[PDB]
């Protein structure tokens with residue numbers, strides 16, 4: 001079961017028990033047994049029959065900007081619903097100390113994975129210096145504010161290892177001002193959807209977060225986990241793409257608003273990201289897919305919420 | 316209130332403006348925060364990005380109320396998580412007890428209204444005194460069980476022997492009437508789940524019933540009230556008006572069930588009851604849900620519905 005990604009324009013339809021994508025060249029069937037989540041970068045129309053069909057199969061649909069920024073998601077009715085786990089989730093938010101621990105854990109994890117990135121790329125960092133701020137803090141806002149500076153410095157330390165063309169200077173998001181900002185925005189937008197998909201495969205309610213504020217209109221928990229997995233996946237993908245030379249100036253375009261990837265660039269980056277998502281690890285002593293890790297992080301969290309195993313963030 | 320679309324067509328962006336095609340009609344979304352689709356509606360990427368930009372949620376439904384899913388845009392409007400308040404009223408024992416008691420109270424009263432309407436001398440209210448002094452949920456449920464048992468046993472006075480309940484039987488049923496009530500209860504279960512999905516309430520969190528079956532426990536809580544109002548009434552009219560005879564039931568290897576003919580008959584009667592007005596029976600369910608939500612945010616204390624018709 002693999003992620004479906006659609007750059008072309010057309011219409012998703014249901015011709016009975018098969019799902020089709022009609023374009024110029026027209027009706028091509030889709031094996032929906034093998035489809036896990038869907039990603040829409042093209043201008044694509046979806047019929048009610050299709051959407052019903054995709055919903056019936058518990059498949060998520062992810063929608064994106066014209067320059068490939070995350071737009072939104074179609075979330076089908078939950079299959080793995082569990083009434084008690086939800087209550088434990090909410091109990092760890094309602095209790096302030098419990099919330100503080102998790103909120104701190106996410107930022108700790110992000111900071112450590114970030115400095116491991118810098119350590120691996122041979123940049124002297126010691127972002128760890130900032131952890132003292134984090135762990136003695138009593139309010140969530142100041143915690144998040146520290147995480148912001150840490151991220152801000154990490155980029156600026158990453159720029160030392162980057163050529164002027166692909167240097168970050170300010171993180172500029174929607175919309176970018178840089179080839180590198182464009183790249184990172186695109187990759188972060190992929191990662192967000194990926195984490196939402198993996199959360200839908202658990203009994204966790206995706207709206208309840210600890211670091212970020214819960215909203216019934218927002219998958220905030222995915223934002224909580226993206227703290228950890230931005231460093232591990234997205235940043236690495238960006239770095240390898242820029243440094244090995246898969247992306248040149250040719251794959252970027254300038255308009256009045258910002259800088260963006262060409263369709264070619266988007267496809268290159270999409271494949272590299274998917275290629276990292278299936279790249280497997282070796283814990284040098286225990287002797288697993290990057291995506292598996294995401295779901296494992298979710299399971300770690302669940303074991304914490306039922307008081308079984310205290311939550312240590314992935315490093 | 317939010318936008319709801321029963322008609323069939325296609326949502327489009329002509330060019331910065333939202334339209335419904337089939338015939339081009341524009342849409343004023345300025346005061347709108349969520350959209351509800353009950354019709355067969357197609358949505359263009361341009362439309363969907365336009366909706367996403369304004370931070371509007373789209374909720375999707377079959378014509379018969381099958382919940383499909385929700386589009387959650389990236390753009391977030393300021394809100395709060397209702398689920399947390401839901402869970403807060405479970406985690407707090409006193410709060411849970413109040414609601415748990417409310418559901419059973421409601422059920423008991425609607426049941427007694429049923430018996431009053433069918434001219435059966437009841438006084439189920441007698442049992443409410445047990446209810447309000449109880450401190451554990453199991454005991455509350457046991458009382459509700461007693462009340463249900465007696466209500467059935469007095470309902471039997473008004474029924475012919477063929478369609479008499481004797482024991483409530485469920486896994487599986489032993490009777491044509493048990494079969495009927497089980498079927499109608501399942502239909503009602505789905506209906507209440509549908510109406511719940513049209514709110515922001517999480518359907519798994521209940522108070523009377525345990526969450527930890529992990530399957531729409533809240534629907535069971537509200538079914539306490541609406542079983543009497545809808546399901547039982549439909550059953551009563553079906554058996555006595557004579558729409559269901561023995562022919563519509565079958566004995567199976569284990570238990571008793573409706574034929575496809577029977578299921579269709581019962582389905583039509585139930586659906587027609589849902590649109591019968593006093594404000595239709597279906598609206599009342601959603602109104603109950605809104606009452607519950609107003610309770611959960613400390614605005615209005617929750618009084619259970621008691622049918623006056």
Ligand SMILES: [Cl-]
Nearest residue numbers: 138139140141
């Ligand atoms: Cl705070």
Ligand SMILES: [Cl-]
Nearest residue numbers: 463483496500
């Ligand atoms: Cl029952």
